Design an enzyme around this catalytic site. Structure first.
Site, PDB file in Angstrom:
ATOM      1  N   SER A   1      61.741 -36.761 -35.742  1.00 51.26           N
ATOM      2  CA  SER A   1      60.482 -37.265 -36.283  1.00 51.26           C
ATOM      3  C   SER A   1      60.565 -38.770 -36.002  1.00 51.26           C
ATOM      4  O   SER A   1      61.153 -39.180 -35.002  1.00 51.26           O
ATOM      5  CB  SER A   1      60.477 -37.099 -37.819  1.00 51.26           C
ATOM      6  OG  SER A   1      59.160 -36.971 -38.339  1.00 51.26           O
ATOM      7  N   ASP A  34      55.360 -27.236 -33.641  1.00 52.42           N
ATOM      8  CA  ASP A  34      55.575 -28.273 -34.626  1.00 52.42           C
ATOM      9  C   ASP A  34      54.577 -29.393 -34.393  1.00 52.42           C
ATOM     10  O   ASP A  34      54.386 -29.871 -33.274  1.00 52.42           O
ATOM     11  CB  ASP A  34      57.004 -28.810 -34.539  1.00 52.42           C
ATOM     12  CG  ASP A  34      57.131 -30.218 -35.087  1.00 52.42           C
ATOM     13  OD1 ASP A  34      58.115 -30.905 -34.740  1.00 52.42           O
ATOM     14  OD2 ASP A  34      56.248 -30.637 -35.863  1.00 52.42           O
ATOM     15  N   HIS A  64      58.666 -28.310 -37.894  1.00 46.91           N
ATOM     16  CA  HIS A  64      59.179 -29.646 -37.659  1.00 46.91           C
ATOM     17  C   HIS A  64      60.547 -29.856 -38.313  1.00 46.91           C
ATOM     18  O   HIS A  64      61.320 -30.704 -37.883  1.00 46.91           O
ATOM     19  CB  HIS A  64      58.177 -30.676 -38.199  1.00 46.91           C
ATOM     20  CG  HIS A  64      58.564 -32.100 -37.941  1.00 46.91           C
ATOM     21  ND1 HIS A  64      58.833 -32.578 -36.678  1.00 46.91           N
ATOM     22  CD2 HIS A  64      58.768 -33.141 -38.783  1.00 46.91           C
ATOM     23  CE1 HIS A  64      59.196 -33.843 -36.752  1.00 46.91           C
ATOM     24  NE2 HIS A  64      59.161 -34.211 -38.018  1.00 46.91           N
TER      25      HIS A  64
END
Ligand SMILES: *[C@@H]1O[C@H](CO)[C@@H](O)[C@H](O)[C@H]1NC(C)=O
Ligand SMILES: *[C@@H]1O[C@H](CO)[C@@H](O)[C@H](O)[C@H]1NC(C)=O
Ligand SMILES: CCCCCCCCCC(=O)O
Ligand SMILES: CCCCCCCCCC(=O)O
Lengths: 269, 269
Positions: free
Chosen positions: A146, A201, A258
């Site tokens: 991320s 994701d 994710h």
């Protein structure tokens, strides 16, 4: 669809990336062994890896992460942590681009990620240079999940060709800049960028292409489900800038996807 | 060390238990398909399973869970949700026993758990009965993880020998009463109890035996690690009341081990 060897590096840095969240780094002494709670990073523990420097809420964009030495694998890993709260981070996301000629010309990158890194690139650049020289036979690697993945990518661009090859492994990273920049990241020398995505994701889909963003090539897409173990037979290399048919598809995206890159990531049990 | 069939059953109810935390379930209309977010219950989703009755913060213990109808596997399933914050639930747990000769003679049980079931037993016995009436052919199963597994165990010892069998599948359930009670739960007929534990999970070690608590027999202990898939050779049947060598071993316990039982449980991605 990738080698057993490549899969193993993807898995290893997936864990290094995870450690940025679940290792006990908080104000951890330099030299300490790197461990993670809830089995987040066993392969990192299985190695002779120690912290070489740790940072928190560092700089103007609150960067957080750690730098490390792996004598077992002969590496110098810089790991960036993503948001403490990704869901909110996803919704607070700003899509504003900003001029980044310094990396490349006609390259525009996410203002937030880029400002965040410049502000800390000075302190961190030296800490890194000190290491290669001691372990020159050691592969330098930049990693992150991320937001952390975006930070790793920008650093990976901003720091290439000073002497050492910088390889980058990003997990569920958002798009980092404009088409020019993606072009750059796809051909830049002095390293390889491994942009890893999982199933639908949502983060690798932001900011939208409709805001001028673009993804570098290639993409290593994980086809296995959330909470499902990943084998080499589950990853697919997708060639070409903004290629579709990988994570970049027109279906409903997901947040749980994710948090699962070869294991539990972005959160700690 | 367990039959493929029992394994498939353990996995199925781990998910029904997980569903008590990750289903949409908070105000859903009876008749509605049961689904979970983050791939918490694929086996339940793959079944023609629907809500018969959903309950939230019901009774005096703020009991939460759902009654379900599964036509694919022919079951009536009453799933109890554990706490919304297990670490704080763990810290506030008090070890008080209270007399329960209604359930079995000489039996004392964790005041809290028994209290909370007591406050909701009428309504639930009722809905369970309607269900059985409508479905005589169906296996009645009570299930739950952590606190939910405790409630499941109480409820089942309470409502057994009403001419309908009750099987109970608990995941990381705390001790629920005294030795008399443990002994009961070990021999009671009209339905088996499958206590399921994982590695060094902390909850099945609470409350401590020192406070007059005991564990029924047997115990199905999962040897595989946290975040590691379970195979039938990873489950071990531990016979004997208060048997050690399963989850009852002298080492430091762990919370993450509590959130794994053949998949992520007690938390939602
Ligand atoms: C650090 O790692 C080494 C080898 O990986 C291990 O032997 C050692 O005990 C760990 N450090 C400490 C202080 O326990
Ligand atoms: C619910 O499940 C059944 C069969 O398992 C299916 O046929 C039905 O269409 C599903 N409902 C919805 C709203 O998808
Ligand atoms: C001025 C109001 C504060 C809003 C904070 C939003 C931070 C987003 C920066 C980013 O794009 O990651
Ligand atoms: C006096 C109010 C505080 C009691 C809070 C409830 C804690 C229940 C004890 C338990 O769960 O075993």
């Amino acid at each position: 669809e990738v080698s057993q060897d490549l899969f193993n590096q993807f898995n290893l840095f997936a864990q290094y990336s995870a450690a940025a969240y679940c290792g006990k780094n908080n104000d951890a002494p330099a030299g300490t062994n790197i461990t993670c709670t809830g089995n987040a990073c066993p392969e990192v523990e299985k190695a002779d890896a120690t912290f070489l420097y740790s940072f928190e809420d560092s700089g103007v964009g609150d960067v957080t992460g750690f730098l490390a030495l792996d004598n077992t694998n002969k590496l110098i890993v810089l790991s960036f942590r993503g948001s403490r709260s990704i869901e909110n981070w996803i919704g607070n996301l700003n899509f504003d681009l900003k001029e980044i000629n310094d990396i490349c010309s006609g390259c525009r990158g996410h203002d937030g990620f880029t400002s965040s890194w410049r502000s800390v690139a000075d302190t961190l650049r030296q800490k890194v240079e000190d290491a290669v020289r001691e372990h020159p036979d050691y592969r330098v690697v930049f990693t992150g999940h991320s937001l952390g993945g975006a930070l790793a990518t920008v650093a990976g661009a901003d720091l290439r060709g000073n002497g050492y090859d910088i390889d980058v492994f990003s997990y569920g990273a958002p798009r980092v800049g404009n088409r020019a920049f993606a072009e750059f990241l796809t051909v830049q020398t002095g390293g390889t960028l491994y942009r890893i995505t999982h199933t639908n994701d949502i983060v690798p889909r932001l900011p939208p292409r409709e805001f001028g963003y673009s993804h570098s090539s290639p993409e290593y897409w994980i086809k296995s489900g959330t909470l499902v173990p990943v084998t080499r037979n589950d990853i697919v290399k997708i060639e070409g800038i903004d290629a579709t048919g990988g994570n970049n598809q027109p279906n409903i995206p997901d947040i749980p996807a994710h948090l699962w890159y070869f294991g539990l990531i972005g959160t700690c049990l």
